[PDB]
Structures are given as structure tokens and as C-alpha cells.
Amino acid sequence: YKLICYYTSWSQYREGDGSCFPDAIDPFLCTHVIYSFANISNNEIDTWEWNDVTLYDTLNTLKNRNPNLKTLLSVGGWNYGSQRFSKIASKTQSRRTFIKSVPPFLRTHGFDGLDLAWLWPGWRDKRHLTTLVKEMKAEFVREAQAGTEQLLLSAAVTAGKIAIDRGYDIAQISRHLDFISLLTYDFHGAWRQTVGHHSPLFRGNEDASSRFSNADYAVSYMLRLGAPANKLVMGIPTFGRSYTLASSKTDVGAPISGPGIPGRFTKWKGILAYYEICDFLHGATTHRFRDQQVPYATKGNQWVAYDDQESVKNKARYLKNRQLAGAMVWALDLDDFRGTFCGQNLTFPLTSAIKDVLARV
Ligand SMILES: *[C@@H]1O[C@H](CO)[C@@H](O)[C@H](O)[C@H]1NC(C)=O
């Protein structure tokens, strides 16, 4: 079973205890740690932060403690224009420059592979993504003849049916990819004017406005789309989402004035790290969507959907039962990485619960 964990670049800038560098990652936690994100500049893979070269180096030295640890670099993300990915991929010359540029850049900085994070191809892009992947792999195949062990290639895929049909030819890319991380935690559109959970595992009975909008839909659908189970990795979120409430209504359908106030360390309207969530829980009312098997919390005018040791465990049981290749965590800097907030001393409490479960019979 793989445990694929993301680390984010911009996490180093958060104040006081929120500051995370790759130094803090326990090297026996994950099987694969993925650095996010890399830029493309001059049609060529490239660093993003001013000091990525250093943080790459600090991450790749975690390999000294655990020589088996695999690392990847992720290209794209959202700060980065789909538009701009589209331009690179849809032309045979910009696509060629970029692909050729990737192996020596990985080798130089000590990575074992590439993660493609194009969020997200439009329908005109679908056929180019397929070509990118296909030719990117052939290049990793060509490079391996040089003696070093073959570079890994993975991709991050949205878990919403619409976005899947629109941008991906799953049958085709699964052939060349070493795994796919399914982004099963963006299932509650913020544009909706009500409460709701974003990584439910099951639809629930509550009403069924969408039956497609849950992890189990996403996984069965990829499998039916011809993604083999052994190349599929289910995404588990480590953060929560928050919404300010339009009333004292707090249950299914409860109306919303908008996103929740910024977390103290992440300072982003609508999102909270698990460590800022454990602190929010003090003085909160706690509930669990029985059917969707994930929790939520509320206090003052603030309502929060999130994952916990129990829901994270339960997802890991589900993916084993389904014989998926493993789990993906978003993300190491949003787990309680210091272990100081969440009562038990335990650091990376969310990621360790998964890890503990993956090891079970
Ligand atoms: C990424 O590359 C683009 C295009 O070359 C460049 O203009 C942009 O500023 C780069 N972004 C960062 C953060 O380095």
C-alpha cells in the first residue's frame, strides 16, 4: 500500500507555529512525498519559490534517513493557468521542449519522478493531456537506458464527474501512469448557499441532490472508466472547510453568508488546517453525518466540515476493501505536524492513523 503525501512550498511563510519546511517531515511516515508546485517557464520545468533549490535539497536529504523514500515534484497546481498548461501541451514544439527538460531537472535536484497537476484541462485539452502523458512516459523510458532507475510519472485528477468527462481520457492515461491520485475532497461547491461536506465517502440519505458527489462515486466511476485499481490512489484531506452561517440554522441545508473567517496560521477565508481545527473544537458542538461517515463542527456563526482520525481510518479501510493502490494525503503541512495542538503529543496524527490502518490485515 502506498501513502502518497503532498508537501506545499508556500507553507514555509506561515507565521510562528504554522511555518513548515521539509525538515519537519518524518521520513518513515509516507512512501512518496510530493513537492508542490513547480513552475514552467520558457516551456521548461522550473522552480517557483526563490529558494526551492534549497527546500528540494532538504527534502531529498530525508532520503538519508530513509533510503526507500520516493519523492516527486508536482508541476502545475492552481496558481498556474490551465490556459498556460494548455498552450504548452497543445503544440508539438512547446510540448517537446518541456518534456525534454524534465528528466535532467529531476535528476539534478534528486527527485524520483514527476507529478502532473494540471487543474484542469478544458474539453479542447483532453486529447493533449493524453499525448503529454504518453510522450512524457516514453521519455522517462528513453532516459532509463542511461542506467539510473526509471523516473516515476503520476497525475492528480479531479474527483467530480463533470471535470473528469470534460478533461481526461482515463483509460488511455492509466496505461502510462504509475499511479493517479484522485482528488476526492472538493465535493461541496462553495458557490452553493448552504452547508455541506466536501469529502463525504458516501452520498447519504439526507436527501440526494447529487448522488455523484462522494468519494465512492468517484472511485467506482474511475474503475468503470478503466483505471485499474492497482494504479489508483484515493485522496484524503487533512484540512477542513469553513463557512460563516446566515442564521442559527446548523444542520442539513442550513443557509450560508459565505466562507468562514481566516484561520490564524493559514490566513485563508474558507479553509482550516487540522491543527487550527483541533483548536476550533474547544467550545464547539460536534456532529457526524451518519451516512457520509465524516464529521462537522460548529460554534458562533462558524460551521466546519473536516476529517478526523476516525473518518480518515474509515476511508483507509474503504480503499483497502476496494483494493486500491493506496491513499493520497493533502497535505503534510495541514496535518498537526508539530503534534502540539491536538491533545495527544502525536505529530501528523491524521497521516499516522492512515498509515497504521494501511499496515493492518
Ligand atoms: C513562472 O513562469 C512564468 C512564465 O515564464 C513567469 O513569468 C512567472 O512569473 C513564473 N512564476 C514564478 C512564481 O516564478
Could you tell me if 63 and 31 are in contact, meaning their C-beta atoms sit under 8 angstroms apart? no
23 and 93 assigned to the same domain: yes
Picking from 154, 152, 131, the residue whose alpha carbon sits closest to that of residue 85 is 131
Would you call 97 helix, strand, or coil by DSSP?
helix
The kind and range of the H/E element at 196 are none
Domain boundary residue, one of 266, 286, 306: 306
116 and 180 assigned to the same domain: yes
121 and 224 assigned to the same domain: yes
Domain boundary residue, one of 306, 322, 340: 306
316 and 300 assigned to the same domain: no
Instruction: Report the nearest-CA residue for atom 14 of ligand 1.
Output: 48
Q: How far is the CA of 47 from the centre of ligand 1 (A)?
A: 9
Q: Which residues contact 56 (CB under 8 A, 6 or more apart)?
A: 35, 47, 73, 109, 110, 111
Q: How far is the CA of 101 from the centre of ligand 1 (A)?
A: 16
197 and 245 assigned to the same domain: no
Q: Residue 302 corresponds to which amino acid?
A: Q
Q: Residue 192 corresponds to which amino acid?
A: R
What's the CA gap between 307 and 185, in Å, rounded? 10
Q: Which CATH number belongs to the domain containing residue 266 in this structure?
A: 3.10.50.10
Q: Which residues contact 108 (CB under 8 A, 6 or more apart)?
A: none
Q: Which CATH number belongs to the domain containing residue 107 in this structure?
A: 3.20.20.80
Domain boundary residue, one of 306, 325, 341: 306
19 and 117 assigned to the same domain: yes
Q: How far is the CA of 41 from the centre of ligand 1 (A)?
A: 6
Report DSSP letters for 28-92, one per residue: TT-SEEEEEEEEEETTEEE--STTHHHHHHHHHTHHHH-TT-EEEEEEEESSS-HHHHHHHHTSH
The kind and range of the H/E element at 224 are helix 215-224
Instruction: Report the nearest-CA residue for atom 5 of ligand 1.
Output: 41
> Could you give the C-alpha distances from 16 to 160, 186, 207, 350, in angstroms and in order?
36, 28, 43, 21
What's the CA gap between 150 and 72, in Å, rounded? 13
The minimum-distance atom of ligand 1 relative to the CA of 40 is 2
Contacts 24+ apart (CB under 8 A), 291-296: 291/202, 291/203, 291/204, 291/205, 291/206, 292/197, 292/200, 292/201, 292/202, 292/203, 292/204, 292/214, 293/200, 293/201, 293/202, 294/197, 294/199, 294/200, 294/201, 296/195, 296/197
List the beta bridge partners of residue 148: none
Could you tell me if 7 and 331 are in contact, meaning their C-beta atoms sit under 8 angstroms apart? yes
Residue 278: count of CB within 10 angstroms of its CB: 19
User: Does ligand 1 have an atom closer than 6 angstroms to the CB of 41?
Assistant: yes
Q: How far is the CA of 11 from the centre of ligand 1 (A)?
A: 19
Method by which the coordinates were obtained: X-ray
What's the CA gap between 56 and 60, in Å, rounded? 6
Would you call 16 helix, strand, or coil by DSSP?
helix
First to last CA, the chain: 12
227 and 215 assigned to the same domain: yes
Could you tell me if 23 and 346 are in contact, meaning their C-beta atoms sit under 8 angstroms apart? no
177 and 125 assigned to the same domain: yes
193 and 249 assigned to the same domain: no
Helices 215-224 + 309-321 axis angle, to 10: 20
DSSP assignment letter at 263: P
Q: How far is the CA of 245 from the centre of ligand 1 (A)?
A: 38
Number of structural domains the chain divides into: 2
Residue of 39, 44, 86, 105 to test ligand 1 pocket, by largest number of atoms within 8 Å of CB: 39
153 and 59 assigned to the same domain: yes
CA of residue 73 relative to chain centroid, distance:
13
DSSP assignment letter at 154: E
- Residue-number span of the structural domain to which 65 is assigned: 1-238+307-361
233 and 259 assigned to the same domain: no
Could you tell me if 264 and 276 are in contact, meaning their C-beta atoms sit under 8 angstroms apart? yes
What's the CA gap between 276 and 306, in Å, rounded? 11
189 and 319 assigned to the same domain: yes
What's the CA gap between 336 and 306, in Å, rounded? 14
What's the CA gap between 160 and 163, in Å, rounded? 5
User: Does ligand 1 have an atom closer than 6 angstroms to the CB of 39?
Assistant: yes
Q: Residue 126 has which C-alpha cell?
A: 483532453
Q: Which residues contact 248 (CB under 8 A, 6 or more apart)?
A: none
What's the CA gap between 331 and 22, in Å, rounded? 12
